[PDB]
Amino acid sequence: MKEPCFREENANFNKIFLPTIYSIIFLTGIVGNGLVILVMGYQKKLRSMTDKYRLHLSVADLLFVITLPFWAVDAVANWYFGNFLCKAVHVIYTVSLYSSVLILAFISLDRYLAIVHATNSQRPRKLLAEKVVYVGVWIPALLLTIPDFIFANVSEADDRYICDRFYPNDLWVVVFQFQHIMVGLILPGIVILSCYCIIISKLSHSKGHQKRKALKTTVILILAFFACWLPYYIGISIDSFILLEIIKQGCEFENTVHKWISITEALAFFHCCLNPILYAFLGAKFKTSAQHALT
Amino acid sequence: KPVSLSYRCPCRFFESHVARANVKHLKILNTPNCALQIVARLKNNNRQVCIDPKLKWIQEYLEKA
Amino acid sequence: QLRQEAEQLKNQIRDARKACADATLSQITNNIDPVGRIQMRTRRTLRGHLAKIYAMHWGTDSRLLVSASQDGKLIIWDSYTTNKVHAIPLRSSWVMTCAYAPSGNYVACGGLDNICSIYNLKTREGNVRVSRELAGHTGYLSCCRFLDDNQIVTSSGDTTCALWDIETGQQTTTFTGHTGDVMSLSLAPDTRLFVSGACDASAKLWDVREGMCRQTFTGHESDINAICFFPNGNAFATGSDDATCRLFDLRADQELMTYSHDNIICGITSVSFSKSGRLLLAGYDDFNCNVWDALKADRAGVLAGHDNRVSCLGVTDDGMAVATGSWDSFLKIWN
Amino acid sequence: SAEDKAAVERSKMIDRNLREDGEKAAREVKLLLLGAGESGKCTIVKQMTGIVETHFTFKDLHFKMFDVTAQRSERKKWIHCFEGVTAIIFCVALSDYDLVLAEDEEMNRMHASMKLFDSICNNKWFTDTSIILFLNKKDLFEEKIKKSPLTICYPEYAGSNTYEEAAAYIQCQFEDLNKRKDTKEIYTHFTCSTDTKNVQFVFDAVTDVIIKNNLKDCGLF
Amino acid sequence: ARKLVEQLKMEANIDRIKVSKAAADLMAYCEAHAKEDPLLTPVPASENPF
Numbered sequence: 009m010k011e012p013c014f015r016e017e018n019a020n021f022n023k024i025f026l027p028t029i030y031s032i033i034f035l036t037g038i039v040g041n042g043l044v045i046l047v048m049g050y051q052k053k054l055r056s057m058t059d060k061y062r063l064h065l066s067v068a069d070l071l072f073v074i075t076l077p078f079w080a081v082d083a084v085a086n087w088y089f090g091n092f093l094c095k096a097v098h099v100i101y102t103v104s105l106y107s108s109v110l111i112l113a114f115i116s117l118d119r120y121l122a123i124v125h126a127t128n129s130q131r132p133r134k135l136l137a138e139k140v141v142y143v144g145v146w147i148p149a150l151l152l153t154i155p156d157f158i159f160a161n162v163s164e165a166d167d168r169y170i171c172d173r174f175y176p177n178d179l180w181v182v183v184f185q186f187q188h189i190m191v192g193l194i195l196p197g198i199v200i201l202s203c204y205c206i207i208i209s210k211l212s213h214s215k216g217h218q219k220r221k222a223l224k225t226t227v228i229l230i231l232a233f234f235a236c237w238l239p240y241y242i243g244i245s246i247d248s249f250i251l252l253e254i255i256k257q258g259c260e261f262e263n264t265v266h267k268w269i270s271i272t273e274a275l276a277f278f279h280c281c282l283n284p285i286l287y288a289f290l291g292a293k294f295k296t297s298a299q300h301a302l303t
Numbered sequence: 304k305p306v307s308l309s310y311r312c313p314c315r316f317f318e319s320h321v322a323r324a325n326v327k328h329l330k331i332l333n334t335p336n337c338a339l340q341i342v343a344r345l346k347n348n349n350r351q352v353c354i355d356p357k358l359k360w361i362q363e364y365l366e367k368a
Numbered sequence: 369q370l371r372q373e374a375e376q377l378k379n380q381i382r383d384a385r386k387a388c389a390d391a392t393l394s395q396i397t398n399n400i401d402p403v404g405r406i407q408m409r410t411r412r413t414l415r416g417h418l419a420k421i422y423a424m425h426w427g428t429d430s431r432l433l434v435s436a437s438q439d440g441k442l443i444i445w446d447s448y449t450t451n452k453v454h455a456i457p458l459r460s461s462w463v464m465t466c467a468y469a470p471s472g473n474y475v476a477c478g479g480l481d482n483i484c485s486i487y488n489l490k491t492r493e494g495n496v497r498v499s500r501e502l503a504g505h506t507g508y509l510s511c512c513r514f515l516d517d518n519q520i521v522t523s524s525g526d527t528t529c530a531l532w533d534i535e536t537g538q539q540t541t542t543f544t545g546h547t548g549d550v551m552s553l554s555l556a557p558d559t560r561l562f563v564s565g566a567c568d569a570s571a572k573l574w575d576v577r578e579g580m581c582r583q584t585f586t587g588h589e590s591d592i593n594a595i596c597f598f599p600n601g602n603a604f605a606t607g608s609d610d611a612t613c614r615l616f617d618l619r620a621d622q623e624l625m626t627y628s629h630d631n632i633i634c635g636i637t638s639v640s641f642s643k644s645g646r647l648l649l650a651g652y653d654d655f656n657c658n659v660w661d662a663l664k665a666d667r668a669g670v671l672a673g674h675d676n677r678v679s680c681l682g683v684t685d686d687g688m689a690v691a692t693g694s695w696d697s698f699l700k701i702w703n
Numbered sequence: 704s705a706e707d708k709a710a711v712e713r714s715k716m717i718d719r720n721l722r723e724d725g726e727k728a729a730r731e732v733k734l735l736l737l738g739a740g741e742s743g744k745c746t747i748v749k750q751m752t753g754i755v756e757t758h759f760t761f762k763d764l765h766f767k768m769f770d771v772t773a774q775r776s777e778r779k780k781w782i783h784c785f786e787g788v789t790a791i792i793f794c795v796a797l798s799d800y801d802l803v804l805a806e807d808e809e810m811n812r813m814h815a816s817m818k819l820f821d822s823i824c825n826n827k828w829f830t831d832t833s834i835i836l837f838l839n840k841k842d843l844f845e846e847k848i849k850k851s852p853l854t855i856c857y858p859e860y861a862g863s864n865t866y867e868e869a870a871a872y873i874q875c876q877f878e879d880l881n882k883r884k885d886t887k888e889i890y891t892h893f894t895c896s897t898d899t900k901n902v903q904f905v906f907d908a909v910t911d912v913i914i915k916n917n918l919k920d921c922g923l924f
Numbered sequence: 925a926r927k928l929v930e931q932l933k934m935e936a937n938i939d940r941i942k943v944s945k946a947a948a949d950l951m952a953y954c955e956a957h958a959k960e961d962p963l964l965t966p967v968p969a970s971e972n973p974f
């Protein structure tokens with residue numbers, strides 16, 4: 009059961025399938041985020057709290073999007089850009105990825121506070137958007153992108169250079185994978201699910217038109233977020249378990265799990281694509297603001 | 304770095320029970336950033352495997368080169 | 369009995385006006401060359417208002433201006449450096465007019481409260497206090513102007529105008545004779561006569577000293593919203609809600625000529641002239657502002673910079689810049 | 704150049720003050736009052752120059768109420784100043800079906816109230832503004848309905864002369880005037896002698912309106 | 925009713941002039957002050973406060 013197999017089979021699919029999807033995501037995300045950011049910039053009236061949250065989300069999505077071409081270059085042939093750029097890209101990727109989800113969690117909390125405590129909560133709704141956001145979304149990311157700074161070095165494998173993180177004693181990998189799983193889906197996921205479920209609970213029996221539309225929207229948001237981010241973390245968990253020798257099987261199972269992870273993460277990188285559509289282009293106020301900014 | 308395109312060196316969890324008499328072919332993979340991997344084909348089923356170099360036979364083979 | 373006599377007198381007036389009409393302005397102004405298209409670019413934008421803006425008035429030094437909004441704040445700006453000089457809170461947040469004294473000492477404000485508040489700016493304490501409150505009207509204030517530091521003229525919604533006396537706080541003269549609400553008022557350069565335009569589509573020329581009406585001009589089909597004199601004081605221009613402007617004549621006692629276009633169907637909220645009386649500014653309802661020609665009736669420029677209805681407009685004494693305030697809570701200066 | 708520094712400091716101070724005042728003022732509730740027959744200001748003022756402004760608080764919420772029955776000018780010329788209010792409280796007297804207008808006996812008073820409500824509800828300025836409706840004189844209507852059948856005002860009505868279905872018919876007729884069914888809602892309440900449920904109903908209506916406004920501000924729909 | 929008749933009678937006997945003369949006077953006034961008008965002829969930026 010210790011016979012070694014080679015990852016060349018996965019490399020054959022990874023060389024061709026990945027960069028095209030990355031290019032499509034890059035184009036669509038850059039177009040959407042540019043439209044959103046120019047609409048926000050050309051607005052002269054006082055910005056609401058949701059406008060501030062959308063401005064943070066757009067900045068995070070832009071930071072994530074400007075990273076894809078480097079990974080496309082890495083996947084297609086090899087690495088060329090040197091140690092400094094390798095480390096900088098590694099640093100940017102993590103902060104963008106974690107901010108893009110903590111912003112969603114904070115938006116869900118803000119909407120809960122606005123819908124449930126509508127008459128009373130008006131000052132906390134501003135405190136959570138002016139002071140707590142920085143101690144919220146950004147400080148954990150800037151404090152957890154430290155492993156990339158400590159150790160992320162380019163190295164020669166076969167003929168090609170590679171920008172990959174290298175771990176001492178092959179444990180760091182499992183502990184960091186558990187960290188990724190926990191931060192990605194369990195810190196913001198619980199808050200989002202609870203707040204949106206109770207909002208749906210408080211907007212179910214009403215017979216209004218606007219209330220019905222809001223109920224449909226919250227369901228769409230929950231379904232989109234969970235369908236985007238669940239299978240990727242399931243695959244990561246399976247890979248961590250098989251690496252931790254809890255599951256003892258042949259390496260064809262390893263190949264299948266790697267294929268699953270690759271396809272599912274390629275699918276899940278559409279969060280930067282879908283966020284401007286879900287959070288900006290489905291609102292009447294933002295539509296009116298964009299129409300005014302057009303002329 | 305996305306997990307999909309990360310680097311994984313092949314031989315993991317080497318054993319220390321392979322006998323010297325079962326060795327049929329000798330080959331060592333040249334791969335850095337991991338523990339040294341030697342893929343020697345066995346004689347029982349002609350299947351390669353990576354084992355740790357702490358074995359007395361492995362130490363003698365290393366010292367005889 | 370009296371109705372027949374009044375009809376006969378009106379017929380005689382119409383016959384005399386028709387007889388006095390020998391030629392129109394457009395026939396004898398065709399000699400002059402038309403003015404080129406006016407390209408006006410905004411210079412400053414003033415922000416700080418949180419609600420609709422209903423009036424404004426340039427100072428006599430062409431640097432300071434005052435704006436009134438529904439939020440209950442009367443803001444005195446500084447147009448040169450965008451800095452705000454004063455922000456006076458209001459007792460009532462329903463305001464529809466404001467004015468700036470010729471000497472820069474006092475300001476005025478009025479609205480749905482039927483009380484004209486006069487505030488003193490330059491006090492010993494260096495702040496603003498209520499200098500006087502004028503009461504006695506039975507309708508909402510629509511416009512108020514300062515003849516001097518002591519006398520103020522107001523036009524109310526009960527078909528009346530009043531010449532007040534700030535020192536005593538009591539009315540001095542009352543001008544009646546209209547039919548509908550009075551929604552405009554402008555003082556002549558010599559500050560001896562003023563015209564008023566009411567809802568009955570009739571503009572009346574009053575007499576401050578005598579206290580009696582002198583001339584009445586008709587020709588409009590809807591409510592008159594704005595009025596202003598020619599810089600020489602010999603003629604004036606009226607704007608109504610039926611998307612038209614008209615130029616009358618005091619001496620000829622007859623309408624001169626009209627400004628209209630086939631693509632305009634929204635009413636006028638404010639009109640103004642230039643220093644030489646050549647360019648006529650008109651703020652229409654459709655978020656726009658037009659620059660007509662006082663002698664050719666040809667459009668020569670559009671000032672499109674607002675996201676909502678334009679409610680007030682003004683031109684400095686030297687004609688350097690024009691300030692427009694809209695319902696978007698922004699004042700914009702063009703030059 | 705100390706004058707420039709002082710001017711900038713003064714501008715910053717009186718900009719922060721205005722921002723704070725606006726933030727404070729955005730947290731309160733404003734209501735307009737309307738009525739056709741008796742100006743609709745009798746019951747609510749006691750129950751709690753040209754305009755009347757009334758402040759009251761209930762369960763930590765500040766309500767201002769604007770009464771504009773002292774303005775006898777044309778309604779078209781000053782109603783746009785009230786665009787953006789939270790709600791309009793319309794008062795209708797139930798004991799006016801058998802009465803006639805003071806000016807002329809041809810038009811019934813409740814028909815004039817219906818016309819005024821139709822004009823207010825379908826105005827171009829008030830499209831997103833909700834209407835709370837009060838039906839007063841419930842006991843007097845109770846007494847009057849038995850003596851005078853509800854047929855002088857509604858000839859097409861076909862029902863027994865009892866309070867419940869007559870009141871339901873009146874409420875249905877008043878609510879049916881609305882044409883913007885998908886943008887605004889009308890809350891109907893019969894005022895009671897106990898001056899403790901009217902303010903609760905107003906509080907509930909204002910809370911619902913605020914929730915529906917926040918549903919749009921947050922961008923959910 | 926008598927007040928309106930009296931006002932009409934009082935305002936009926938006033939002096940009037942030909943429309944052509946007034947139009948010529950307006951044209952002359954407009955032409956006289958065409959040299960000093962910052963809106964008609966834009967002022968160079970050296971002396972422009974804005």
Ligand SMILES: CC(C)CCC[C@@H](C)[C@H]1CC[C@H]2[C@@H]3CC=C4C[C@@H](O)CC[C@]4(C)[C@H]3CC[C@]12C
Pocket residue numbers: 060063064067103146150
């Ligand atoms: C990698 C990181 C540290 C780069 C800097 C990113 C963070 C710190 C930047 C990116 C976009 C920035 C925001 C852009 C817009 C606004 C709106 C403004 O009204 C207040 C500041 C605020 C909210 C900024 C705060 C700082 C911000 C969130």
